[PDB]
């Protein structure tokens, strides 16, 4: 939801074309009294309480909460035997069928999330195989998130990624309350 | 719009067995978008309902209503249609099984009134439906007689139980 923007919008009685004049005198006609043909009671009239977009849903959970969520997702995967640690993501070939057959033989779920340490240094073989697949998705370590982890039945992390994740997530437990955004220089951050 | 009445003359029954009885022929026919009121047409369709083909044609020939000349025209072409297409031997051996009218598609027009007022008049149209059946007209039901009234009354006195007990 945080990045959701709804573009739904309707016209109120003020924005519907026309509708200036009183359609007929207040009294004497025997009809119901009306002030405008564009009232929400009329066919073609304005919408009383319709969507008034564009509408933003932005909000931010506390940084510590979002970090804890990642920890929970990793634990759940390990506790349920859905986490596999690899030394590297190098395949012998770039054929997607190899990777598909490998998952079937090792009894991995239908979908597998592949997490590499860095986008630039992803092996070319795994890049070729995953690029041609739909349920086998390759992401960098910076892309790890709860939604992707839950959507994919199996999570595969490289050993360098494991070190990367522990460093970033445990920093949240031992850190001071900030004095200014962490993008600015600190004594001991980054690394 | 619905046009099911014209599709009833296309039903093909399986051949009958040697022992089964002769099946009467049924002929469905109608006329659509007649410039006439269905309420006024209903009195004419009710008149010939149950009559023979030759008796209905005689009653409609001396009626002064406009719908009479139309129904009679629909009956004459349904009679010929029966013998020519539906394998009816005698053209007089037909009677009116069903005959009713239906509302057609109508048009709306303005009727000017005084004081700048107006009404909307419908230009009325109707349908006429008829079903012919081969054979003589079924004999009319005799009026209930005193013997039947008494026989029914005594039957109710014999069917009454002791209520709200064992």
């Amino acid at each position: 939801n945080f990045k959701r923007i709804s573009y739904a919008k309707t016209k109120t009685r003020a924005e519907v074309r026309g509708g200036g004049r009183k359609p007929w005198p207040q009294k004497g006609t025997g009809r119901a009294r009306h002030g405008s043909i564009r009232s929400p009671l009329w066919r073609g009239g304005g919408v009383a309480h319709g969507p008034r977009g564009p509408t933003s849903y932005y909000y931010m959970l506390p940084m510590k909460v979002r970090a804890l969520g990642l920890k929970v997702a990793l634990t759940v995967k390990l506790a349920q035997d859905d986490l596999h640690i690899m030394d590297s993501l190098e395949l012998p070939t770039g054929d997607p069928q190899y990777l598909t057959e490998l998952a079937h033989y090792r009894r991995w779920g239908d979908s597998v999330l592949l997490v590499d340490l860095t986008h630039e240094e992803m092996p070319q073989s795994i890049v070729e195989a995953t690029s041609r697949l739909k349920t086998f998705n390759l992401i960098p370590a910076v892309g790890l998130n709860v939604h992707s982890m839950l959507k994919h039945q199996t999570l595969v992390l490289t050993l360098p990624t494991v070190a990367f994740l522990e460093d970033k997530l445990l920093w949240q437990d031992s850190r001071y309350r900030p004095l200014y955004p962490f993008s600015l220089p600190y004594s001991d951050f980054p690394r | 719009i619905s046009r099911k009445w014209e599709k009833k003359n296309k039903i093909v029954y399986p051949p009958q067995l040697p022992g089964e009885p002769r099946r009467p022929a049924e002929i469905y026919h109608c006329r659509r978008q007649i410039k006439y009121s269905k309420d006024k047409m209903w009195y004419l369709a009710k008149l010939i309902r149950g009559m023979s083909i030759d008796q209905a044609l005689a009653q409609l020939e001396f009626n002064d209503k406009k719908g009479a000349k139309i129904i009679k025209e629909v009956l004459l072409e349904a009679q010929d249609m029966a013998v020519r297409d539906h394998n009816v031997e005698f053209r007089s051996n037909l009677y009116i099984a069903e005959s009713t009218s239906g509302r057609g598609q109508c048009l709306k027009r303005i009727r000017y009134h005084g004081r700048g007022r107006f009404g909307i008049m419908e230009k009325v149209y109707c349908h006429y439906f008829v079903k012919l059946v081969e054979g003589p007209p079924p004999p009319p039901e005799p009026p209930k007689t005193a013997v039947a009234h008494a026989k029914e009354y005594i039957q109710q006195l014999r069917s009454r139980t002791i209520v709200h007990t064992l």
Partner: peptide, 20 residues
């Protein structure tokens, strides 16, 4: 008592002009 007159309003013509 002030004169009260309600003028008549004609409906749109097209509503009574449609043909088959």
């Amino acid at each position: 008592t002030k004169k009260r007159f309600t003028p008549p309003i004609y409906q749109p013509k097209f509503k009574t002009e449609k043909e088959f």
